[PDB]
Amino acid sequence: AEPTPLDRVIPAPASVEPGGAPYRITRGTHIRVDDSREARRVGDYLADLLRPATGYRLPVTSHGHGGIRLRLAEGPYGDEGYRLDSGREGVTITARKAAGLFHGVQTLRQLLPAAVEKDSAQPGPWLVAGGTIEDTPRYAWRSAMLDVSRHFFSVDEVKRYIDRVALYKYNKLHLHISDDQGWRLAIDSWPRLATYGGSTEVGGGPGGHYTKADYEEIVRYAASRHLEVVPEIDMPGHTNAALASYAELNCDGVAPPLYTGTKVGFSTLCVDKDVTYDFVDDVLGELAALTPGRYLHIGGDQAHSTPQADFVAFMKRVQPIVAKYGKTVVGWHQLAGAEPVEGALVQYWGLDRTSDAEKAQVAAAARNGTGLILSPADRTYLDMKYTKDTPLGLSWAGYVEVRRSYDWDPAAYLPGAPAEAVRGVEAPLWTETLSDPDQLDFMAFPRLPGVAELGWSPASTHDWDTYKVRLAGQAPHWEAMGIDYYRSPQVPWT
C-alpha cells in the first residue's frame, strides 16, 4: 500500500529529496530509451529484471509518454552517477553514460517491493516513492574479489557472483585465478598450467580452469554489469600450481607435488633463473590480451620463502612487464616496501594487529604518491568468521561482525597516509573453506553491501544506527532472490 522510503537504498545516495505521490508500474508501463543503443542495452536489462515478477510486457521503446525513461544527457553526474526522478507520471533516470543508467536501475530495484525480485508473477502493487535522488560515488575503486584458486567456481557461478556484486554498485571484479592449489586460466605458451596445475583444489576435488573462451565470456558478462575485471596472477609466492606443472621453474629443477592443503608462504618462483621471467612475460602477455581493463594484479603477498632482497629484485624486474603490455600494476601491500613503480597501486590487507613499522611503510609509499586500495583483513575480508560460532570462514584476523565491517572511514584509517592517496576499497572473498555458491553467499551477505557503501556514499551519510535499518530492509529482497545470508543479531531484521 505504501512505497519503501526514497532513502532506504544501499549505498546511501549522495542526495535524497522525497516528495509527491509515488509512481505505480502497471501493465501499460513502457521503458523508454530514445535513440541511444547504449541506453537500449540498459532498458533491456531493466525489462529482464521486471518482467518475471510483474508479468507485464514492459516493451523497450524509443518514443513514448510517461512510464520509465532512461535518458543519456550532459549533466553533473560524472561517469558513474545519475539522477532518478519519480512521481505519479513516471520515473526518469538520467546520466552521462550507460554505467550511470545502470547504477540508477540498481537503486530503482531497491525502491521497488521485494517481490519484484521473484521469478514468477506476483500481485504487486509496484510502487516507487516520489522524489528526486542525485547520486555520485565517493571513490572510484569499489571492488569485490573472488578466489577461484582454492576452490574452483564455474563460469556460471562467477556470473552469479557478478550479479550479486552489481546490486551494490561495485565497479571492479578482482579474480584471484592462481594460487598454490590451482591455476585457473589456459595459457597457450605453457599448456600444462591449466591441465595439470588446474587439475585439483583444496580438499583434493577435481578443480577446473577457464579456457580462453570461458574467460572472455566472464569478462564480457562482467562488462555488461559495469564491472572492470582485474585479474591476479600471484607472484612470486602462492605459486605452487605453476611450480608443480613445470619442473624448470623451481630453483632445484624438481616439480613439487600438487598442493590440496590450506597452508601459506611455502612456495616461491626462482628469482635468479632467466626462465622465470620468460614464464612471467608469456603469462602476463596472454592475460593482457584477454584483459580490456586497465590493471594487472601481480599479488606479492606471503612470499615467506623469498628473502627480502630477492623479493625486491623480482618485483623490480616484473613491474616493467606489466607496463610493456600496457597495463597498470596492482600488488598486495608487501609491494610498498619493494620499490613500487610510478602509478602502481597497492592493496592494503593489514589489520589492527599488523606491526606499526609495517603500517608506516605503506603510509610512506602513500605519502610518496602510491595509490592505496583498502581491504583490511579485520574489516572487509568476507571469509572472516562473524563470531566464534560461524561454521565456515577463518578467524586469523579475529572476528568481524557486521558493524565492525561497516563502521570505519577509509579517509581516516591508515595513520600517516594522506586521504587523497586512498583510491577506494575492496571486499575480498577467499575460498579455503567455501566450496559451493550458497556458502559464498552466506559469507558475502550481509557485509558485502556495507563495503560497497564505504566505496560509494559520502562520509556525511555514514552512520551505523541508520545504516543497519537500511540493511535490514534488504533481507526480503535477498529472500526473493534466493540469497542465503547471515542473520546477524546486530541488525534489526523484520
Ligand X SMILES: CC1=[NH+][C@H]2[C@@H](O1)O[C@H](CO)[C@@H](O)[C@@H]2O
Of the candidate residues 85, 201, 286, 301, the single one contacting ligand X (CB under 6 A): 301
CB of 330 to ligand X, least distance (A): 12
Nearer to ligand X, 72 or 444 (CB): 444
Nearer to ligand X, 381 or 456 (CB): 381
CB 197 within 8 A of CB 259: no
CB of 350 to ligand X, least distance (A): 9
Cα 130 from Cα 127, distance rounded (Å): 9
Cα 455 from Cα 270, distance rounded (Å): 38
Amino acid, res. 307: P
Among positions 178-197, residues that touch ligand X (CB under 6 A) are none
Nearer to ligand X, 167 or 344 (CB): 344
Nearer to ligand X, 45 or 486 (CB): 486
Among positions 394-433, residues that touch ligand X (CB under 6 A) are 394, 430, 432
Residue 313 exposed, middle or buried by CB count within 10 Å (0-12, 13-18, 19+)? middle
Sequence-separated (6 or more) residues with CB below 8 Å from residue 465: none
In 3D, which of 357, 260, 269 has the Cα closest to residue 313? Answer: 269
CB of 261 to ligand X, least distance (A): 12
CB 345 within 8 A of CB 372: yes
Of the candidate residues 126, 141, 381, 386, the single one contacting ligand X (CB under 6 A): 381
Nearer to ligand X, 108 or 362 (CB): 362
Q: Is 383 in the site for ligand X (CB under 6 A)?
A: yes
Among positions 237-296, residues that touch ligand X (CB under 6 A) are 264
Instruction: DSSP for 419-475, please give it.
Output: GGGEEEEEEEE--SS--SHHHHHHHHTTHHHHHHHHHHS-GGG--HHHHHHHHHTTH
Q: Is 349 in the site for ligand X (CB under 6 A)?
A: yes
Distances (CA, A) of 494 to 181, 342, 469, 473, 484: 41, 50, 10, 8, 16
Q: Is 332 in the site for ligand X (CB under 6 A)?
A: yes
CB of 181 to ligand X, least distance (A): 10
Nearer to ligand X, 28 or 391 (CB): 391
Nearer to ligand X, 23 or 259 (CB): 259
CB of 319 to ligand X, least distance (A): 18
The cell numbers describing 436, all together, are 559451493
Q: Is 77 in the site for ligand X (CB under 6 A)?
A: no
Pairing of β 295-297 and β 23-25: unpaired
- Residues at the interface with ligand X (CB under 6 A): 264, 301-302, 332, 349, 381, 383, 394, 430, 432
